[PDB]
Structure 1
Amino acid sequence: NPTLFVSYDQNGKKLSFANWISVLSPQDTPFVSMTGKESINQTIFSWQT
């Protein structure tokens, strides 16, 4: 094999990959977290004022 053995002449070398993923995702949701839930039956709802 080549005279001088260096990192560029290596085959079958492990990847040294990282076992995680940078999940940089904001999901605060301040509004929906305090609005409130109310079930309905139709696709159109109305109210009086």
Structure 2
Amino acid sequence: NPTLFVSYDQNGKKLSFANWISVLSPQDTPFVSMTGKESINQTIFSWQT
């Protein structure tokens, strides 16, 4: 039987979750982000020199 209702007897919360997630795992991929890409037809290929 409270008489003040101070931030503890307030039933029916919402939990005010956030709208994001922190994936702190390392995703740094400089080699891949620097090297280009090219669409190849078949699995095997070759290059002259």
Structure 1-normalised TM-score?
0.52
The answer for unaligned runs of 5 or more in structure 2 is none
For residue 42 of structure 1, report the CA deviation from its aligned partner.
0.4
Root-mean-square deviation over aligned CA pairs: 3.5
Greater gyration radius:
1
CA distance in 2, matches of 1:32, 1:16: 38
- Deviation digits for residues 1-34 of structure 1 (CA, Å, limit 9, x no counterpart): 9999999999999999999876331101000001
> Percent identity over the alignment?
100
The answer for unaligned runs of 5 or more in structure 1 is none
Number of residues of Structure 1 aligned to a counterpart in Structure 2: 49
Which runs of structure 1 show a deviation greater than 2 angstroms over 4 or more consecutive aligned residues? 1-24
